């Protein structure tokens, strides 16, 4: 029901009253994103949000937890004159949806933060939430973005490019 605008009035409701027992929550937070993410296509500011903050709650895995809520910044932020830190939770949705969602693409959300990068002006809380992850990065999925990350070496604030370049 993700597409078919009209049946996610009642899309929503008709998946989000069972949550059965399911011996283990292997399965939980993607019940709390996709209904979620019903809220994340109509204009459902808060719901959605907290829905993606008790879904990540449940297992801290499952990128796809972090990665709708970063789909929905987008939403958010494309909207908006950018630039309050409100892209720095995107930042991070992207970057904790980048490494440990492994063995398939990758390119969508890393060429997404290649472009969220350089919109620095003027907060530097981007690059410090860049920064702050620690953990697993896509050491080899980046090397197909690597001319565009050394034609953006030339550019101002690359001293966190740098620990991209250096495992490469």
């Given at each position: ?57 449940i ?23 950018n ?66 990350l050394?034609?953006?070496l ?15």
């Amino acid at each position: 029901h993700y597409q078919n605008m009209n049946e996610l009035t009642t899309g929503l409701d008709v998946i989000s009253n069972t949550n059965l027992v399911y011996f283990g929550t292997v399965q939980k937070a993607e019940f709390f994103t996709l209904k979620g993410m019903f809220l994340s296509k109509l204009r459902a500011y808060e719901e959605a949000n907290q829905a993606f903050a008790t879904a990540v709650q449940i297992d801290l895995n499952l990128a796809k937890a972090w990665a709708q809520w970063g789909f929905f910044n987008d939403r958010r932020l494309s909207e908006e004159p950018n630039n309050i830190s409100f892209a720095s939770n995107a930042i991070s949705c992207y970057l904790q949806a980048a490494g440990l969602y492994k063995n398939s693409k990758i390119r969508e959300l890393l060429c997404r933060i290649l472009w969220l990068i350089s919109i620095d002006d003027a907060s530097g809380m981007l690059t410090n939430a860049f920064d702050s992850f620690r953990g697993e990065i896509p050491v080899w999925y980046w090397i197909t973005f690597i001319p565009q990350l050394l034609t953006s070496l030339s550019h101002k604030e690359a001293n966190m490019v740098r620990h991209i370049l250096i495992r490469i």
